[PDB]
């Protein structure tokens, strides 16, 4: 029933500011901090050996894009090793994004670990030392960082536990971060296996937000000075319904606006899986959405920024621009979604700025 | 992880349709449900004896104000006996409610009961047959009631018990009551009593009400079919430290962007103890805070709304005119405040500008 | 963090005294609190008319039974009714029940009621006015309570909400009942119901307890204080798998002994369903089981008492004795179980126990 | 509500047998699992430099001590360092210990760390990689594990987040023990700072300890295969209030009953600051006191089976027989401690219980 305040007022003020530049308006986020093993996967997508120089060329590509995407990129999430990487002009990579406008990210995570008595659930690891790390991070360049949960739709899951747990680890997380001046992104990710519906989705989504929310209360996590990374919600992938984008932006935003306090700064979503195309337009319907919504909806794109960037590379330094274009082309049609003002292809009418409401009880 | 469904579509849309019309732009609530015990007391403040004729009386002198009213009022509260009473005209007061663009409220809770073992804390009681008499009371003209739940700022209060005690008996008066048709206010006021400061006030406000959400959560209530009925945030009673209309504002809805779900409908205040010029200024200053908020802010005044009314109508039928102008008075007031466009002017008299603060059991 | 006693030394020693005297070596319950609409179902079976004579004079049959039930009934759970009539001398029931060596009991709880939003869940009502009821009932002659919850075995049951809510009721009915010198028996009963096996049934059982001894934790129950009225742990009624008394007795018991503080006074098993014999030869191979019990192993049993003696009464007065001598006998069997003394032929002489390899680790 | 074994029959039946072994009659647990900060404390005290070649000696000095301590010792904890380390016959610590009749233990934990929002509370780090360590030391001889939580009681602490956090910890500890054979010592440590009296420790370790179990059955724990090291119930080091040893006795026993399952195998306390004699003469009169204590009630001793051999050691060679005796005059005293069979008036043995003085209701 007593205070002891977690932070001072200018700490409250340097977490929020930077929260804020994050997600401002038309800006969005590149996920590009696959790991080691993770990155391997993509480049053997591409035929090219995972050496540390082809990742650093890779990193390269996209942290060098021109200017284009600069209003587009409001952060950059790295993995370590990117972040202590430079560029051929020996600028330092952290350099790079921040002389572009954006603000650099670090992942914190140490992947999954199986949570026994469970039906194949998990949470995540990676608190030891983490204070020294984000001292350390944030003195070389990080204002942000992003620990990912991992959860499974399933007959039994997610359960009771896993919920609790995950929930429990990102409030820690969250915790540890706000005291070392670093913006944590909550990421507790549902992922979108398996054959359930809309509304099942929608459900699950709703009880894991209002678990995170009431553990990061339990922690004295500073809201304000925080990012939400969630999926969307969508049916799953082996499910024989169809549905329509603005049902996908109206069974997110319904299930946000049950759970997400307002003081949450932004909310910055995972594409899991989306193509670039897919994961855009979703994220236009959302923001096109009729409800209220009092925080940014934009994007922190992995997958969706980078598929078209890769296969055009294909590990050849010959392909630069050609590479590049693909990025920066997929950065912009995500900033114009974040403002809802995106249309795939052609289209004849340029900001797209319309209203209708659907059902909105259905949900 | 599966969701059974509480509430049809069609049953969330009139929960939903009901929630709003209650907080509609410029309109509050008259919170009239004041118990036989407890209207005694209020009798007596004007020599008034206690009698079913006079307190009849009373309410209908609130009930039928003239129309001026009619725009700022969009719900009213009774209490068991005032919902079957009549008007002078033969009217049920529910249909005199209706007949002006407002809709029946009418409280459930049974009062508060203590919790052992802790420093003299309570719950609230109320749920055995809530169904039934739900059930009955829509039949009878309410589509919305109120519950409420006290808590206690001191050294060691309010404890995880009553908070968590507290914020389950809402979410089952929460959940029964929608299986009726009926809107639920959930109130979990936070007594001002004691000497602690605006900080603390708003740190035991955020924590009570990130509880009460994750009870409602877990006990699947349909929140867009809910209202908040919580404390302002303000010093204790006894605090000596001053605070300006601003600050109390800025700390009330920091506290509610920080738990509080967009979905929820809207936020009714109750006045606590304030005077009935302090509770419209602060809920002018409230609507006035630069901050974003994602639901309607407006009043569910008891004495902020009867103060002068009572004191012009002294018993005596004469002063009939006389009260139900000092009513009038202050709904047009709350009115604008619910807007942030009040203005004291000068009026509402020194019975405007006493406190109704009581305390319990002595001190 | 702070002690705030709920109870004096002296009202734990009341509690405390209470609770022993009623699972004293050799006792048990005689639970004959079914509601008039319960014991409808009775006297129906028995093609007799549901009248408060003929509920009076089947009471007093099992109440008035000769002496050699003395020691084996340690308490009568009586319904409301039955607390206030008496026997064909004038005698209370009450004062008869005590004048033969038993405590007097009382069931307190209102029904089960719909948990919305579940899959067929239910919490049970009763709260209100609970304090004042206990406080009557103790004036009258009952010194110690009963509240029954139920929870279901199914795909989806019971769930984390029915599994908190439950437990969470039956801990404010225990806090309630302790400030009134009554001693209350939680029972938080699992049905049979369904084809889950006998695993499952441990499982869910760890489960519930686990939840339930924390909720009592939480609101300050004095254990020593209390009684639990929990299911032995047996496969669904509609299970194909085949078990011995052993297995049910070696499940029933870890399951007790992973969840069971040593503190709580007596465990006093229901029938729920089990046949009078089937009922008996499991409490006494839960007795000779090979495991240490901090805890008196006894029986509360309803049917499993009552079932015969119903069915020689007939409604008929000329089978008195012969309905009296049924009750006798399953007294006098149960008395003998609960003591791990049960065969179908005994009386002071015994040497067997036989019962070699069981690896508990199966469980 | 549905069973997911974490656990094999096979696994349980492994992890059962060793945390038997440990706590046999008689038997106790050896803590030398000093960290190199804290062991440097130890050296310190006594003037001697703090190499790696003087923390091999002094462990060597506890190891080798002669067979008088084989009866008294059922384990012996040691920190990663030390389980490499290889006595001046060349055979490896664990060797040395299990030839001794003793099971291997290894300290987990990596320290205590704040807990931000709080007023200086911590929980404790060390998941990360646990499970890949837990197979390796596993390999390396180990058979059990340890992992230490501290909270301490204050006008604010142990809060409901330090109390839920560090439960949570521990059973995810206990969780990644157990999938790797390994048996988890569960120690939720409640300093003895401050001036709060026995009621209080009382109060603190109860609702501790409940939180505790509940951890352990959320998380699938297997109790049957874990022990717990708690700190015994004693008012704080500076309480003005004087008590006896039986009223601690009776406090730490009672706490124990009403939150300890049945099922968990042993109780090894630890000295926490109690000189040599007090912990000896405390754990007799624990396993005196008259309750039932359902579980094995020994010792997990560091400097109170240490304090005089380090004294006796002084870091001088020619010191080891005198050191060691120290040390065996310790693990005798507590062995027999632990069966209740320690008298205390030098080397005497020829006493029992004295001076009837029931009361036990006041706890």
């Known amino acids: 029933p007593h205070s002891h305040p977690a932070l001072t007022p200018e700490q409250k003020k340097e977490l929020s500011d930077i929260a804020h530049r994050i ?25 090219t050996e995972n050496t540390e120089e082809n990742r650093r060329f890779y990193r390269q590509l996209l942290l ?13 999430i790295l993995f370590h090793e990117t972040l202590y990487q430079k560029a051929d002009d020996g600028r330092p ?9 954006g603000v650099v990210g670090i992942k914190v995570d140490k992947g999954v670990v199986p949570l026994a008595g469970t039906n194949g659930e998990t949470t995540t690891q990676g ?4 204070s020294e790390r984000c001292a350390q991070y944030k003195k070389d360049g990080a204002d942000f960082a992003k620990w990912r949960c991992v959860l499974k739709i399933g007959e039994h899951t997610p359960s009771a536990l896993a919920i609790m747990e995950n929930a ?19 990421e507790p990710e549902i992922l979108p296996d398996g054959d359930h519906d809309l509304k099942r989705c929608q459900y699950v989504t709703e009880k894991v937000l209002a678990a995170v929310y009431k553990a990061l209360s339990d922690h004295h996590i500073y809201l304000e000075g925080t990012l939400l990374k969630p999926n969307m919600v ?6 024989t319904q169809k549905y329509s984008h603005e049902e996908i932006a109206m069974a997110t935003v319904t299930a946000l606006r049950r759970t997400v306090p307002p003081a ?13 195309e897919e994961a855009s337009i979703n994220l236009n319907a959302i923001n096109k959405c009729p409800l209220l919504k009092p925080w940014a909806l934009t994007f922190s794109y992995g997958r969706a920024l980078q598929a078209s960037a890769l296969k ?30 995106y249309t795939p292809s052609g289209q004849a009418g340029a900001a797209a700025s319309e209203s209708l409401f659907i059902s909105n009880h259905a949900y």
Chains 1, 2, 3, 4 share one sequence.
């Not at 990579?93 to 406008?101: A, D, L, T, Y």
């Not at 949450?264 to 670039?276: D, H, I, N, R």
């Not at 049609?333 to 974040?338: G, Q, V």
Request: hydrophobic share 35%; net charge positive; charged share 20%.
């Open 312 to 341: 055009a590379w294909g590990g050849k330094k010959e392909n630069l621009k050609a590479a590049q274009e693909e990025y920066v082309k997929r950065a912009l049609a995500n900033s114009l979604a974040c403002q809802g003002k």
């Open 64 to 76: 060098t894009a021109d200017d284009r995407v600069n209003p587009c990129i409001g952060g950059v």
């Open 234 to 239: 969508t049916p799953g992938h082996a499910c």
């Open 23 to 47: 997600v401002a308006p038309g800006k969005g986020i590149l996920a590009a901090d696959e790991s080691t093993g993770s990155i391997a996967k993509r480049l053997q997508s591409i035929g």
């Open 93 to 101: 990579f952290p350099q790079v994004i921040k002389s572009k406008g």
């Open 264 to 276: 949450v700064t932004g909310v910055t979503f995972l594409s899991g899986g989306q193509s670039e």
């Open 168 to 186: 429990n680890v990102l409030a820690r997380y969250a915790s540890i971060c706000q005291q070392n001046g670093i913006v944590p992104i909550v």
């Open 127 to 130: 608190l030891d030392g983490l």
